[PDB]
Structures are given as structure tokens and as C-alpha cells.
Write a protein that binds this ligand. Structure first.
Ligand SMILES: Nc1ncnc2c1ncn2[C@@H]1O[C@H](COP(=O)(O)OP(=O)(O)OP(=O)(O)O)[C@@H](O)[C@H]1O
Ligand SMILES: Nc1ncnc2c1ncn2[C@@H]1O[C@H](COP(=O)(O)OP(=O)(O)OP(=O)(O)O)[C@@H](O)[C@H]1O
Ligand SMILES: [Mg+2]
Ligand SMILES: [Mg+2]
Lengths: 331, 325
């Protein structure tokens, strides 16, 4: 039996974590969740103990912690703090067309590998003189090599064919250029993989017109935020796609688009699919593959039934009715 | 009856600027063209170019070949506001049919400050610059654009959760301009959520105001929703009443003289140009004759579907704009 940290988070986090527990119970998953909560308190005591708990269990499942962007800059995003403190340097999401969720595009099958600790997320800003603010985007060779190594290894191991580095090196010549150059260094050791690059602006334009051209995509932190959300939207929205955050020893699983869903919480309408799929990825990571597969196929099969769809994907069903159908299909 | 500074540019540039002139003529637009060449010399644009533009204050620019000149022109005229209205086009079918968004992009600072440092070997710092001055400036333009174009809603697009001090200041100045312009309804949304929602239901968006890099990306995303850079108009607003409206597609050298170009985009930037001055009816008629041409589908250029030459496309707009009140 494995002990896993569970951070309920805000908005729809708590309610969806209850359904993960119900599914895990019915499936007799040998996993015990050890819950840590993170308040809105300016004090980092909460976020600090959640880190210590993940350092101990090594594996976590989390909802999104709300960030109040009206608070002073000293009050930092708790999600970013946790990401960076545990050095979970790879954010990985898999956006794939679901035959039961028909959108404007089909045949999409994209693995996005996003540098998850650096870049525009470094929390370095200052006001030299009043009304003049500088924010410091940091790109390093060590972290860009690291994420590029991850993307090419993932491409090779899952049998993919192309890695596209997404960047703005035409304007940020030194920073995005370094990131691009680190991708190129790694590409030289994976001659069986096609390496291409594309400017982030053109990438969005190609995603809304021919997203089928993309295979594996690797990019620094903010561009990954953009491409993750574009790709998630293309395949049916934030209720569907799971995300993973990997470091060398730790791993935290969540929904791909990292949304709180405050405006739909406690209404029994949130789509549980992405949270459930995240909990299966965590099960695979724990080498509990037979459980992961039982739950995932039930979850995926439920998607083929439009009667089970929640409103975010054009349906009318409640969360609990979706969970009921998932549990009925775990046998 | 004022005159514009025309910059035909290179490759297919002349062709489509010819096409736009013939159509403005068939509409009897109080507009004749003062052709001028901008090229990096000495670094600067030629004196005969800066003089026409300071005189007429209105320019129409086609595609240039590849210091960046749109950087040069921006600093030379203080082009602080990039504006890209994107409207789905009847007859040019994309999976997005209800798009009507104007991205309004701060064009001077933000992530494009030009300042990077190698801090130590293998460690690079790129400076994002947000100033209270330029932020207020682009917010006031956004709200002013909304009024004069009968736009109901403005959204500030930001990442102030992650970049609190910089994006937060941008937000704070958007907020102030909002509370003095309550006839336009103001809201705020995270850049990633805008992106997430945009590709699902773009009809929910009206006017989007945001700092430089977000505007750079989102304006291209939106243009991808309606068909591409071949059809999308663009305008840049500068200091002392200058404004340059432009193609944003390539020069297309591979078809540069073969009379196959699509002039739609430069034309709609010219329509946009007219509306900026105030010759609304000429704009409305040229626009309508263009939209009706593509809707008709008989005279589609090879990039928009059919196998019609560029001047057969231009002529049909000519015929249809002569027969419209
Ligand atoms: N699991 C889910 N099921 C259904 N909808 C979701 C889910 N997760 C996110 N969303 C939706 O995705 C969007 C982005 O989420 P976000 O966290 O901004 O929502 P929110 O806090 O409810 O925003 P607001 O309060 O402005 O509506 C929201 O519209 C939310 O309703
Ligand atoms: N107005 C237009 N009408 C028709 N085709 C166009 C037009 N503009 C561009 N194209 C086509 O699209 C491409 C134009 O791209 P262009 O060469 O101008 O620059 P780009 O592709 O943006 O960048 P790069 O110069 O690096 O290729 C060509 O293939 C051309 O045939
Ligand atoms: Mg969030
Ligand atoms: Mg752009």
C-alpha cells in the first residue's frame, strides 16, 4: 500500500478529490491519501508543510490553489512555489482527440513538454523608479538541456517521430536562443527523431488551423502555459486533459489547465474526467498499472456515451452521474 | 481631399498596392497616393519617406523584404498601438465562423525591451519592462477605440498572478481608465484562460487589450481563426497623429510578378485606414464589395480556393463597388 499526498486545492478541487476516493475505494486501489490543506494565508506555513509531505511521500495529487493577484508581490503563487521548491522541472500533458467529444478538429495527438521552474515564472521583479517595473525572465543552459533531454527521451520511448521546439528567439535572441541551442545539442544525440522549431506566434496560428502537424512539443515556461491551454481547448476543454509535473525523484499530478473552477464549484456539474485521468497517471507512476488501466478504460469508455457528458462538453449530466457510470464500468 | 503615403514594398507588394488604388478609384475615394520607398540607410528610413509621413500622417504599407524596419518605423513614429480587427469572412470557410475580435497590443515595451544580459555563463536574463506611462497610454487608446467603433466590451489580458508587479501595474492602469469610461464594460482575464476559451468559443470576445508579447501572440492566434495573414488587416497608431496601416503577410517572391496575389489584406487595412480618418461610407462600400466578391466565390484567388488571377479579383470588386450606393 502506497501513501500519497493529496492537496484538495480550491474551487472544484475538494469535490473532485472525493470522487477520486470513491473510485479508488470501489476499485480497491492499494493507495492511502494523506491530505494537506493550503489556505489563502500570506504565511507560507501551509505551502511549506505540503512540500515536506511530498518530499516524504514522493508522489502527490493536487487541485489548483487559487492565486489572488490583488495581493502584494511578496504573496507568491502557492502552485508556483510548490513546483519550484520540489524542482518538478517537466510539465507534461497529452492532448488527444476523443472520438466521443467532437470539436472543430480531429486526429489531434500532441505531447507537450514544458519547462516548469524557470523563464517568466522566476518571481524576480523590482521598481527602480516609481512607475517603472522590470520583471526578470531567467533561462539557463542546465534547465533547458534538462527539459530537452526529457522531451527527446519521451519522444523516443513512446515511439513518436518529431520534436518541435517552440520559442521567440527572433526577438529574445539571448534567452530563447539559449533554450533553442540546448534543444539542438540534445537533438544531435537523437538522430532518429526529427527536430524542428517554430516561433510561438506562428505555433498558435498553426494549432487553430492544422494542429495535426504537431507531435511532441518542447518549450520554456510561459509558452507552455499558452500552448497547453490552446491544445486543451482544441480537444474539448479543461475538463478532459490530465497534467503531470515530474522532477528527478518527485511527481505531482493535476488537471492539465490548472483551473480552480470557483464559479462552478459545489454545483455537481464539474467534469471529473481530467482529475480521474490524472489519478490514473499517478497510478501508472506508482507501477499500479492494472488499477490505472481499469479506471482509465472505464473513464474513457464513459466519454463515448454523450448521455454522460457534463455541460462543459455539450452535455447535461451531473458529476455524480458521470462517476456513477465510471464506477459501473469498473469490473 | 487629403493624400496618403503609399509604400508598395517588395515582391507582391506593388501588385496589391496597384489593386488597392484601382479599387479606391472605382469608389471615388477622396484619396490619391504618394508613393515612397522606406529602406535602411546610413540607421534610418530615407528622408523623403519620413517627410511624407509627417506631412500626410497616414500611410498604407505593403510587405517588405528582410535592423528590422517595422522596429525602425515604430521607433521613428512612436507607433505605440498595434490594432488587429479579426472578422470571420463569409465565403472563406474556417472552423470559426463567429469571430469579431479586435486585439489591441501595446507596441513599445513589455517583453520586447531589447535588454538581455548574460549574467554568468549559461544563465541569461531577459528584462520585461512595464511602465505606468505606456500602460495608461495603451489603455486609453483601447477605451477610445471601443467608443469610436461601437464596441461594447474591453478585456485586459494578463498574467498578474505570476508576474505580479509588472502585469499588475499594467492591470492597475487598465482599471483606472475603466472607472472613468463606464459606458464600456471592462473585465480582466488570465492569458491562458483567454487562450483556452478562444479556441472553443471565440464569439465571447470583443476588444482585447494587453502588453506587448501577449498581443504579439494573440493577434496571430485570432488571425489564424479567420483564415490567415492573407486576409487580415492591421493598423499601427503613433504619436502626433501618425498611423500606418499594413499588410502583415509575406512578400511572396515565388508569385511576385505572376499576377496571382491576394490583395484582400492590404485592401482591408486600407478600409481600416479610411475609417480611421472618417470616410466611413467609402470604407463601408469598398468593404462590402470585397466581402460580396469572396462570398460570391466566382473570382477567388488561388490562395482562397478558386483559380482566378489577381486582376480578375480586383476587377470584380471594381464592378461591384460601382453598382453600390
Ligand atoms: N472540471 C471542469 N469542469 C467544467 N468546467 C471547468 C472545469 N475546470 C475548469 N472549468 C472551466 O474552465 C474555465 C477556467 O477556469 P477558472 O479557474 O478561470 O474558472 P473560475 O474561477 O470559475 O472563473 P470565473 O470565476 O471568472 O468564471 C472556467 O470557465 C471553468 O468553469
Ligand atoms: N498576399 C498573398 N497572396 C497570396 N499568397 C500569399 C500572400 N502573402 C503570402 N502568400 C503566400 O504565402 C507565402 C508568403 O510568405 P512570405 O515568403 O512572404 O513570408 P513568410 O512565409 O511569412 O516568411 P518567410 O519569408 O520566412 O518564408 C508564400 O508561399 C506565398 O505564396
Ligand atoms: Mg489557476
Ligand atoms: Mg504576432
Amino acid at each position: 500500500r502506497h501513501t500519497v499526498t493529496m492537496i484538495p486545492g480550491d474551487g472544484i478541487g475538494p469535490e473532485l478529490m472525493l470522487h477520486v476516493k470513491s473510485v479508488f475505494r470501489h476499485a480497491c486501489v492499494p493507495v492511502d491519501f494523506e491530505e494537506v490543506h493550503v489556505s489563502s494565508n500570506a504565511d507560507e506555513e501551509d505551502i511549506r508543510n505540503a512540500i515536506m509531505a511530498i518530499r516524504r511521500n514522493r508522489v502527490a495529487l493536487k487541485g489548483n490553489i487559487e492565486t489572488n493577484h490583488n495581493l502584494p508581490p511578496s504573496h507568491k503563487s502557492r502552485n508556483n512555489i510548490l513546483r519550484t521548491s520540489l524542482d518538478l522541472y517537466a510539465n507534461v500533458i497529452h492532448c488527444k482527440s476523443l472520438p466521443g467529444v467532437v470539436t472543430r478538429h480531429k486526429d489531434i495527438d500532441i505531447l507537450i513538454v514544458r519547462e516548469n521552474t524557470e523563464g517568466e515564472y522566476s518571481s524576480l521583479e523590482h521598481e527602480s523608479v516609481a512607475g517603472v517595473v522590470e520583471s526578470l525572465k531567467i533561462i539557463t543552459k542546465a534547465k533547458s538541456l534538462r527539459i530537452a533531454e526529457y522531451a527527446f527521451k519521451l519522444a523516443q520511448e513512446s515511439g513518436r517521430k518529431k520534436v518541435t521546439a517552440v520559442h521567440k528567439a527572433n526577438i529574445m535572441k539571448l534567452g530563447d536562443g539559449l533554450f533553442l541551442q540546448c534543444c539542438r545539442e540534445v537533438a544531435a544525440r537523437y538522430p532518429q527523431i526529427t527536430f524542428e522549431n517554430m516561433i510561438v506566434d506562428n505555433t498558435t496560428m498553426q494549432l487553430v488551423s492544422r494542429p495535426q502537424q504537431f507531435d511532441v512539443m518542447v518549450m520554456p515556461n510561459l509558452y507552455g502555459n499558452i500552448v497547453n491551454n490552446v491544445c486543451a481547448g482544441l480537444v474539448g476543454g479543461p475538463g478532459l486533459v490530465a497534467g503531470a509535473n515530474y522532477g528527478h525523484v518527485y511527481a505531482v499530478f493535476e488537471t492539465a489547465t490548472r483551473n480552480t473552477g470557483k464559479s462552478i464549484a459545489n454545483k455537481n456539474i464539474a467534469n471529473p474526467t481530467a482529475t480521474l485521468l490524472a489519478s490514473c497517471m499517478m497510478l501508472d507512476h506508482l507501477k499500479l498499472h492494472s488499477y490505472a488501466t481499469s479506471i482509465r478504460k472505464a473513464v474513457l469508455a464513459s466519454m463515448d456515451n454523450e448521455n454522460m457528458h457534463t455541460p462543459d462538453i455539450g452535455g447535461q449530466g451531473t458529476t455524480s452521474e458521470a462517476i456513477q457510470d465510471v464506477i459501473r464500468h469498473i469490473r | 481631399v487629403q493624400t496618403v503615403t503609399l509604400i508598395p514594398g517588395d515582391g507582391i507588394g506593388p501588385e496589391i498596392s496597384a489593386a488597392v488604388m484601382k479599387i479606391f478609384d472605382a469608389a471615388k475615394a477622396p484619396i490619391q497616393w504618394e508613393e515612397r520607398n522606406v529602406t535602411a540607410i546610413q540607421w534610418m528610413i530615407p528622408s523623403e519617406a519620413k517627410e511624407s509621413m509627417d506631412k500626410n500622417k497616414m500611410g498604407l504599407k505593403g510587405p517588405l523584404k528582410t535592423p528590422s524596419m517595422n522596429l525602425l518605423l515604430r521607433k521613428t513614429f512612436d507607433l505605440y498601438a498595434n490594432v488587429r480587427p479579426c472578422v470571420s469572412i463569409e465565403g472563406y470557410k474556417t472552423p470559426y465562423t463567429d469571430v469579431n475580435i479586435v486585439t489591441i497590443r501595446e507596441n513599445t515595451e513589455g517583453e520586447y525591451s531589447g535588454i538581455e544580459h548574460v549574467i554568468v555563463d549559461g544563465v541569461v536574463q531577459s528584462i520585461k519592462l512595464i511602465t505606468e506611462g505606456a500602460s495608461k497610454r495603451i489603455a486609453e487608446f483601447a477605451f477610445e477605440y471601443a467608443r469610436n467603433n461601437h464596441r461594447s466590451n474591453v478585456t485586459a489580458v494578463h498574467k498578474a498572478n505570476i508576474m505580479r508587479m509588472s502585469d499588475g501595474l499594467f492591470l492597475q492602469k487598465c482599471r483606472e481608465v475603466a472607472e472613468s469610461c463606464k459606458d464600456i464594460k471592462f473585465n480582466e482575464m488570465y492569458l491562458d484562460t483567454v487562450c483556452l476559451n478562444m479556441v472553443q468559443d471565440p464569439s465571447q470576445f470583443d476588444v482585447l487589450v494587453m502588453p506587448n508579447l501577449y498581443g504579439d501572440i494573440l493577434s496571430d492566434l485570432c488571425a489564424g481563426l479567420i483564415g490567415g495573414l492573407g486576409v487580415t488587416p492591421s493598423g499601427n497608431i503613433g504619436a502626433n497623429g501618425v498611423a500606418i496601416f499594413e499588410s502583415v503577410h509575406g512578400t511572396a517572391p515565388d508569385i511576385a510578378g505572376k499576377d496571382m496575389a491576394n490583395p484582400t489584406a492590404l485592401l482591408l487595412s486600407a478600409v481600416m485606414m479610411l475609417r480611421h480618418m472618417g470616410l466611413f461610407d467609402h470604407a463601408a462600400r469598398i468593404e462590402a464589395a470585397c466581402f460580396a466578391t469572396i462570398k460570391d466565390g466566382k473570382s477567388l484567388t488561388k490562395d482562397l480556393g478558386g483559380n482566378a488571377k489577381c486582376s480578375d479579383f480586383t476587377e470584380e470588386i471594381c464592378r461591384r463597388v460601382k453598382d453600390l450606393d
